[PDB]
Amino acid sequence: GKKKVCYYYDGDIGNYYYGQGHPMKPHRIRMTHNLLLNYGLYRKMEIYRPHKATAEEMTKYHSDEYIKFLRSIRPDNMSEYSKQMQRFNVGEDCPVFDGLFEFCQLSTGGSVAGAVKLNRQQTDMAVNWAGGLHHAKKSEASGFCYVNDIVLAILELLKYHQRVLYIDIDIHHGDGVEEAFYTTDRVMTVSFHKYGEYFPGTGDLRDIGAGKGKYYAVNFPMRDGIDDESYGQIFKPIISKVMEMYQPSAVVLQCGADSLSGDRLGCFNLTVKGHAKCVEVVKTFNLPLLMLGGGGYTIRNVARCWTYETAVALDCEIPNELPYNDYFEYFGPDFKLHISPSNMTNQNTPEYMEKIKQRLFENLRMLP
Numbered sequence: 253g254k255k256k257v258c259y260y261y262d263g264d265i266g267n268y269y270y271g272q273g274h275p276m277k278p279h280r281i282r283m284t285h286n287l288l289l290n291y292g293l294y295r296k297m298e299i300y301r302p303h304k305a306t307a308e309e310m311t312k313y314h315s316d317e318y319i320k321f322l323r324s325i326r327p328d329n330m331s332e333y334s335k336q337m338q339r340f341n342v343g344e345d346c347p348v349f350d351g352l353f354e355f356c357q358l359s360t361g362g363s364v365a366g367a368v369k370l371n372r373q374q375t376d377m378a379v380n381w382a383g384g385l386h387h388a389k390k391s392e393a394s395g396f397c398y399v400n401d402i403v404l405a406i407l408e409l410l411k412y413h414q415r416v417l418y419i420d421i422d423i424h425h426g427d428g429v430e431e432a433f434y435t436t437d438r439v440m441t442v443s444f445h446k447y448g449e450y451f452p453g454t455g456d457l458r459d460i461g462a463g464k465g466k467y468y469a470v471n472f473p474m475r476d477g478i479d480d481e482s483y484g485q486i487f488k489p490i491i492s493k494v495m496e497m498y499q500p501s502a503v504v505l506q507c508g509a510d511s512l513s514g515d516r517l518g519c520f521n522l523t524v525k526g527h528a529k530c531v532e533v534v535k536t537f538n539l540p541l542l543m544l545g546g547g548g549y550t551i552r553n554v555a556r557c558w559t560y561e562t563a564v565a566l567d568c569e570i571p572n573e574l575p576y577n578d579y580f581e582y583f584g585p586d587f588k589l590h591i592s593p594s595n596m597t598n599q600n601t602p603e604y605m606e607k608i609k610q611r612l613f614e615n616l617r618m619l620p
């Protein structure tokens with residue numbers, strides 16, 4: 253039936269600024285929060301302010317030298333760290349900005365706190381829209397991500413769950429999470445992403461894991477223009493087969509909204525309903541679930557998407573007419589919650605979708 257939902261948010265998160273021209277805008281998290289507050293979604297959720305994750309909590313995965321660097325670097329002392337900046341890939345995509353470490357602490361704190369709440373059986377679902385920073389590596393920042401809150405949250409869930417399923421619907425391949433668990437069978441990673449002349453360049457359908465992790469990494473490479481019909485046609489059958497074969501006891505779902513139509517960096521054509529159908533599919537399995545944010549660069553659509561996915565988690569119907577809110581003008585000219593797909597061509601033919609699904613089904617037959 254209806255599930256208990258715990259939501260993590262710090263009111264300071266929207267003030268972190270990556271810099272002029274940078275597509276990553278933490279302000280979209282504040283827009284999401286304000287929109288869901290104005291729809292009355294706080295009446296049914298337990299809202300928590302995450303703690304600031306310590307350097308020590310982050311080193312359960314990341315190297316001590318990398319976390320020490322993140323805790324020390326600032327725009328005013330950058331000149332003295334040119335060597336470490338190159339070593340840790342801090343530069344254009346992952347810039348040094350005021351409060352960088354505190355931003356990482358809040359993003360991570362929400363994910364780890366949600367995982368602890370799930371481990372204690374005190375909630376059915378935990379939501380952290382500030383998390384889902386899937387590209388960060390053990391000793392390297394990557395693709396706007398510095399600390400991999402997902403890996404840290406999964407490590408927390410592994411304290412009480414033998415098998416954890418990670419599902420990533422961001423348009424970009426979830427490389428940092430896949431790499432962290434590539435040689436283990438205790439985590440199965442499933443990523444649906446655009447593949448071909450696109451960041452980060454990984455996630456080929458032939459990348460299936462290694463050693464004890466062979467067959468525990470699943471990648472569904474897609475081309476431009478995927479729509480609700482095509483995505484829905486493969487998501488439920490793949491996830492149903494993964495649930496059947498792997499039998500996870502907890503799930504983490506990365507809900508990156510850059511797979512929506514009209515995204516500044518993405519080239520997919522999903523609507524908010526099509527994207528949210530993934531949340532509905534996962535929720536139906538009735539397993540402890542951690543829902544996280546991720547990409548999303550047309551910020552009015554990210555706020556619409558995550559507001560609707562929070563309503564989905566709560567089993568609460570909300571009207572298409574947007575309520576008045578602090579950012580009302582950002583939702584013009586329509587002031588509606590749902591979006592329309594564009595006229596872009598879907599390069600993923602129905603035959604391509606079925607063929608890739610069949611190759612993934614062959615790999616899933618190899619599980620014990």
Ligand SMILES: CCC(O)(O)CCCCC[C@H](NC(=O)[C@H]1CC12CCN(C)CC2)c1nc(-c2ccc3c(c2)[C@H]2CC[C@@H]3C2)c[nH]1
Nearest residue numbers: 273274275344345385386395396422424451510546547548
């Ligand atoms: C949160 C999860 C997630 O998955 O959604 C994260 C997605 C990350 C996409 C990263 C991608 N980077 C790249 O494609 C890497 C090969 C480069 C090209 C761009 N230059 C600056 C660095 C080297 C990329 N970077 C940009 C980008 C656009 C505009 C700018 C920048 C990056 C910086 C330099 C100018 C401004 C700031 C676009 N695409």
Ligand SMILES: [Ca+2]
Nearest residue numbers: 420422444445
């Ligand atoms: Ca993905």
Ligand SMILES: [Ca+2]
Nearest residue numbers: 433439465468
């Ligand atoms: Ca794995």
Ligand SMILES: [Zn+2]
Nearest residue numbers: 422424510547
């Ligand atoms: Zn992305």
